[PDB]
Amino acid sequence: SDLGKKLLEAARAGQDDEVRILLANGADVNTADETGFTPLHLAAWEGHLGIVEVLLKNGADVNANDERGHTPLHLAAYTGHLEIVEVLLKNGAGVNATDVIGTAPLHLAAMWGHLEIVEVLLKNGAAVGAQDKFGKTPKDLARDNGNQWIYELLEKAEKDLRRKLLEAARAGHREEVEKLIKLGADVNTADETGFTPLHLAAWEGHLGIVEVLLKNGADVNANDERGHTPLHLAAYTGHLEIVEVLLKNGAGVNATDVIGTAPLHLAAMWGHLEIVEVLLKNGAAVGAQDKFGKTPKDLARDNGNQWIYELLEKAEKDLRRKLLEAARAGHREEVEKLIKLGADVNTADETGFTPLHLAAWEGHLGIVEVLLKNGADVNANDERGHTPLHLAAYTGHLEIVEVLLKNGAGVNATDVIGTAPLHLAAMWGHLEIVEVLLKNGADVNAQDKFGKTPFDLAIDNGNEDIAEVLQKAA
């Protein structure tokens, strides 16, 4: 619009009567130049109050944005035209509008020292905590630029939001909380002992506030000065719903304070059955001990929470059963985790088979290595007196024999019948394994219950090759 082009220049120039003529003619009040500036942008950037008010009466978009997100309120605050600021807000300007850099009007007012404008912007709900791409707040800009009066004004406002926020989270003022967050309050501020608004909201049982704080980016796993997370406090005080929300939002179900106390310790200690079930269902480890060696089960037993003791006792039994089943099936992932939850690595079934036994019998070298480094007894015996090395030689798992011996497997161990690993290897014709056993110092003269030697068993089973080797070894 050529007519709108002259109106833009008429606003930059400041000719009220010329503008009035152009408004009665009908030239678009929201004309825009190449950048995106409208007649109301320039009336505010130059400081023509009367013109501004007149454009507002003809419905100039109070929140028009140029190609970089600058509104008329940005420009008025930049240049320091207080009368235009107050007017623009009277027409519903966005007090917290930000450009593509995240700069708000309060950034500009604070930087250039327009105290009166700063006071007004705050009176209309400006967020003191807003940060730009450089991470600067209006307080930091004032400070860095030497506006001590303004810096102290904003430093005092931030100090008040942190205090009022914490007091609201601890008091249950869901509305007051949501308000203070809009005003820039640091959602992750911490009191003298490190408690955040989330700690307090969980400690006091304000589910609503816990939901708001999380939606706004609160650290769900925030630690006080001693390692207590909000999940700790929710379990301590016993707020099922909060415990659920936190876990849904990524809470550390096994987080431990400086005393090794986890949330499960506290639920069991203070008899919060429902929360105990939620924590176990979400991966809580039953084997965790505090600095006194007490597990969650010890604390329920010591504190008289029997039904909770039963559940934890069952959970322990279930993990040691699943570990045996995982070791057999060949599920390294299931094994590794079950070991973390607290599954006894040296547990045994009815036969006396341990997870290591099952792993050697089924030929799961991966799972074998996991158990060994986790302290699995290499020379564990079953009712038959079998060692994992026995089962390995029985089945021909070469690599599992090497790893077992590597980790100290009794090479000359004998079962109840006196059978040794070398007997099995020669009996079942595992040439390569016979070479490893003898190379690892295996007894060649060993006799079983029948006086038979590994060579004799190589004869009876008719493995010439292994026979010639045992014959050469002797």
Side-chain angles (χ1 to χ4, degrees):
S1 177
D2 303 329
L3 305 172
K5 200 173 208 167
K6 282 307 312 179
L7 177 58
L8 291 173
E9 211 62 12
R12 175 183 270 121
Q15 299 139 351
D16 298 37
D17 294 86
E18 181 63 13
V19 171
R20 167 157 52 91
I21 297 167
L22 296 159
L23 295 181
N25 186 311
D28 190 32
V29 66
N30 294 328
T31 308
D33 64 332
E34 296 258 335
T35 67
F37 287 140
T38 77
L40 181 57
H41 276 69
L42 309 182
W45 172 256
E46 300 297 350
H48 313 310
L49 167 56
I51 293 175
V52 172
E53 292 175 333
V54 173
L55 276 73
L56 297 171
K57 270 290 149 191
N58 291 44
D61 184 23
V62 69
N63 295 323
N65 293 18
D66 60 340
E67 59 179 345
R68 299 292 173 264
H70 293 115
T71 65
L73 189 64
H74 282 139
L75 311 179
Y78 195 144
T79 59
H81 302 146
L82 173 56
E83 295 72 36
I84 297 169
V85 170
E86 308 188 87
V87 167
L88 287 171
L89 303 181
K90 278 265 182 171
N91 282 241
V95 67
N96 288 313
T98 67
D99 64 328
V100 64
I101 308 300
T103 306
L106 187 61
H107 281 92
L108 299 168
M111 180 171 61
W112 294 111
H114 308 309
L115 165 58
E116 309 306 339
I117 287 170
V118 170
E119 291 173 345
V120 172
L121 293 176
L122 299 176
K123 172 166 159 55
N124 292 254
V128 297
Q131 300 171 59
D132 57 36
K133 298 295 169 175
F134 302 100
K136 294 289 178 183
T137 70
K139 147 174 158 272
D140 303 333
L141 297 172
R143 176 189 63 209
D144 296 339
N145 215 20
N147 311 329
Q148 195 65 6
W149 307 320
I150 292 168
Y151 160 68
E152 296 184 1
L153 186 72
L154 305 182
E155 212 299 311
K156 193 181 289 148
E158 296 176 1
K159 196 193 184 189
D160 279 280
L161 293 188
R162 301 185 184 186
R163 178 180 55 82
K164 297 172 97 180
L165 171 58
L166 299 167
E167 298 168 353
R170 155 159 260 168
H173 300 337
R174 188 189 202 272
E175 301 79 18
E176 181 63 12
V177 171
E178 289 172 345
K179 182 182 179 179
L180 299 168
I181 294 175
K182 286 201 179 71
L183 313 185
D186 190 340
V187 72
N188 287 335
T189 183
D191 60 341
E192 283 64 22
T193 61
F195 291 140
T196 68
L198 200 57
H199 283 106
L200 304 173
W203 178 259
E204 300 286 346
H206 304 308
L207 177 57
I209 298 170
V210 175
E211 298 174 350
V212 177
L213 297 169
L214 292 169
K215 197 176 180 184
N216 299 124
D219 186 27
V220 66
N221 280 280
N223 300 22
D224 67 341
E225 60 181 7
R226 294 299 189 273
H228 299 135
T229 74
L231 187 61
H232 279 96
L233 307 180
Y236 191 128
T237 55
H239 299 125
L240 180 72
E241 298 82 344
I242 295 172
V243 175
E244 294 176 343
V245 174
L246 297 173
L247 288 161
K248 176 181 178 176
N249 280 252
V253 69
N254 286 314
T256 71
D257 65 16
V258 68
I259 316 301
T261 301
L264 190 59
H265 285 82
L266 301 169
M269 172 68 188
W270 299 106
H272 301 305
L273 181 73
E274 295 83 352
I275 288 168
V276 171
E277 294 172 326
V278 178
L279 297 173
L280 293 165
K281 176 177 181 177
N282 285 273
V286 187
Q289 319 176 53
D290 64 15
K291 297 309 187 187
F292 301 88
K294 299 276 169 161
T295 58
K297 183 161 68 65
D298 295 45
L299 298 169
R301 170 177 49 79
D302 286 20
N303 206 32
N305 302 139
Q306 262 293 329
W307 180 238
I308 284 169
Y309 172 86
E310 304 294 355
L311 265 52
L312 300 174
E313 183 67 50
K314 173 191 152 56
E316 296 190 350
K317 284 166 164 171
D318 284 26
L319 299 188
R320 53 175 54 99
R321 172 179 51 76
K322 293 183 185 202
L323 179 61
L324 289 162
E325 292 176 340
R328 175 189 260 111
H331 299 348
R332 175 156 188 172
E333 288 187 341
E334 187 67 4
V335 166
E336 282 207 347
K337 92 182 191 182
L338 291 173
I339 296 162
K340 178 58 174 182
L341 289 109
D344 187 335
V345 70
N346 297 292
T347 185
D349 63 17
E350 307 170 7
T351 314
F353 274 33
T354 68
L356 189 58
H357 275 116
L358 302 170
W361 181 254
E362 299 297 344
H364 298 331
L365 175 53
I367 293 176
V368 165
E369 296 165 349
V370 179
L371 301 176
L372 289 149
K373 69 191 188 190
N374 289 251
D377 189 344
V378 188
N379 264 80
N381 294 12
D382 61 10
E383 63 188 14
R384 291 294 309 177
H386 288 129
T387 306
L389 186 64
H390 278 96
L391 312 187
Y394 200 118
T395 50
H397 298 134
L398 177 62
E399 307 202 27
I400 290 173
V401 172
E402 299 183 345
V403 174
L404 284 167
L405 295 155
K406 171 178 177 299
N407 299 41
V411 61
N412 300 322
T414 67
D415 62 338
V416 63
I417 280 180
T419 309
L422 197 66
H423 291 83
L424 307 173
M427 194 177 198
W428 284 85
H430 304 283
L431 174 60
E432 293 178 319
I433 287 179
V434 181
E435 294 177 355
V436 180
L437 295 184
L438 295 176
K439 173 162 61 177
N440 272 269
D443 190 343
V444 57
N445 304 285
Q447 313 180 66
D448 65 332
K449 170 177 179 178
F450 308 132
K452 293 239 181 297
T453 74
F455 186 66
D456 299 22
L457 299 175
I459 300 170
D460 304 329
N461 288 84
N463 288 288
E464 294 182 332
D465 295 334
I466 289 165
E468 300 295 350
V469 181
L470 287 156
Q471 195 184 53
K472 188 174 190 65

